[PDB]
Amino acid sequence: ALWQFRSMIKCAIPGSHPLMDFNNYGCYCGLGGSGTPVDELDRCCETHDNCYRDAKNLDSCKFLVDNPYTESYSYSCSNTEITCNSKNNACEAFICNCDRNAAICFSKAPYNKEHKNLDTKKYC
Amino acid sequence: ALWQFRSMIKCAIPGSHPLMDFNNYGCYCGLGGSGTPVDELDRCCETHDNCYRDAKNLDSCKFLVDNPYTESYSYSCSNTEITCNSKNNACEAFICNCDRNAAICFSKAPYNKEHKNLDTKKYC
Ligand SMILES: COC1=CC(=O)C=CC1=O
Ligand SMILES: COC1=CC(=O)C=CC1=O
Ligand SMILES: [Ca+2]
Ligand SMILES: [Ca+2]
Ligand SMILES: [Ca+2]
Known part of the structure; x- marks a missing residue:
C-alpha cells in the first residue's frame, strides 16, 4: 500500500523524504506518466508504473x-x-x-x- | 491473515501458544464449527467465524x-x-x-x- 512504499524508500535511502523527493520527478515519478523517462530515476518510476499495470492485469487479483x-x-x-x-x-x-x-x-x-517538477507538457 | 492472528493472540496473551491452545477447542475454535458453543472461549471463536462470514459477504471485498x-x-x-x-x-x-x-x-x-479436542460429533 502507498504508505508502505513511502517507508520502503526511507528504508533503502535513510536520509530521505519520499513524498518531497520522488513525487513529480521527471515524466513517471507521480500520478500516471507520459513519454520516455528522462532518467534512471524516472525509469525506476516507469517500471513501477508498469509493475502496477501487470498486477492490475492478473485475473486472480481484484484490488x-x-x-x-x-x-x-x-x-x-x-x-x-x-x-x-x-x-x-x-x-x-x-x-x-x-x-x-x-x-x-x-x-x-x-x-x-533539474528534473524535480519537470514541465511534463513540454518534455514528456 | 492467519499468521497475523496467531501473533495477535500472543500479543494479548503473552504466555501462550495459539496453534496449540486455540485450535480444536470446543465446537468453533478450528476449521468450520457446528452446534452451540460450549464456552465463552468457544463463543469468541464462533463470533470470529461469523465475523469472517460477514467480510466474505461484503460486495466490495474479493479475497x-x-x-x-x-x-x-x-x-x-x-x-x-x-x-x-x-x-x-x-x-x-x-x-x-x-x-x-x-x-x-x-x-x-x-x-x-476439558474442551480442548472435544468430541465434536457428540457435543457440538
Ligand atoms: C505516487 O508516486 C510516488 C509517491 C511517493 O510518495 C513516493 C514515490 C512515488 O513515486
Ligand atoms: C483456525 O483456527 C485457529 C487457528 C489458530 O492458530 C489460532 C486460533 C484459531 O482459532
Ligand atoms: Ca507514475
Ligand atoms: Ca492486504
Ligand atoms: Ca471455526
Whole structure:
C-alpha cells in the first residue's frame, strides 16, 4: 500500500523524504506518466508504473477501488535491506516486489535536481 | 491473515501458544464449527467465524481463494494492546478487527482444559 512504499524508500535511502523527493520527478515519478523517462530515476518510476499495470492485469487479483496501492502487505526493513514477507498472498507479494524493486532502484539512480517538477507538457 | 492472528493472540496473551491452545477447542475454535458453543472461549471463536462470514459477504471485498485469512493487514502490538492500522483498506480493516476482537476475547474467556479436542460429533 502507498504508505508502505513511502517507508520502503526511507528504508533503502535513510536520509530521505519520499513524498518531497520522488513525487513529480521527471515524466513517471507521480500520478500516471507520459513519454520516455528522462532518467534512471524516472525509469525506476516507469517500471513501477508498469509493475502496477501487470498486477492490475492478473485475473486472480481484484484490488480495492482497483488500485494496487490500496493493498497492504507486510514487509520488514533491516538496515537498508527490504524483505517482503513470504507469507504475503500472491497479489500482495507481487505488489510488495514492485515497491521493493522500485525502492532498491531509487537508491541506485542518480538524483538530478533539474528534473524535480519537470514541465511534463513540454518534455514528456 | 492467519499468521497475523496467531501473533495477535500472543500479543494479548503473552504466555501462550495459539496453534496449540486455540485450535480444536470446543465446537468453533478450528476449521468450520457446528452446534452451540460450549464456552465463552468457544463463543469468541464462533463470533470470529461469523465475523469472517460477514467480510466474505461484503460486495466490495474479493479475497484471494475466497478466504479472508489470506488477507494481510498490518497491525501493531504494544504490551497487550492490539492496534489496527487506520491505513488498512476497508476489507483489511474489517478482517483486522475480527482478529483483534477475537484476541481481546480469548484474553478474557476462561480456558477450560476439558474442551480442548472435544468430541465434536457428540457435543457440538
Ligand atoms: C505516487 O508516486 C510516488 C509517491 C511517493 O510518495 C513516493 C514515490 C512515488 O513515486
Ligand atoms: C483456525 O483456527 C485457529 C487457528 C489458530 O492458530 C489460532 C486460533 C484459531 O482459532
Ligand atoms: Ca507514475
Ligand atoms: Ca471455526
Ligand atoms: Ca492486504
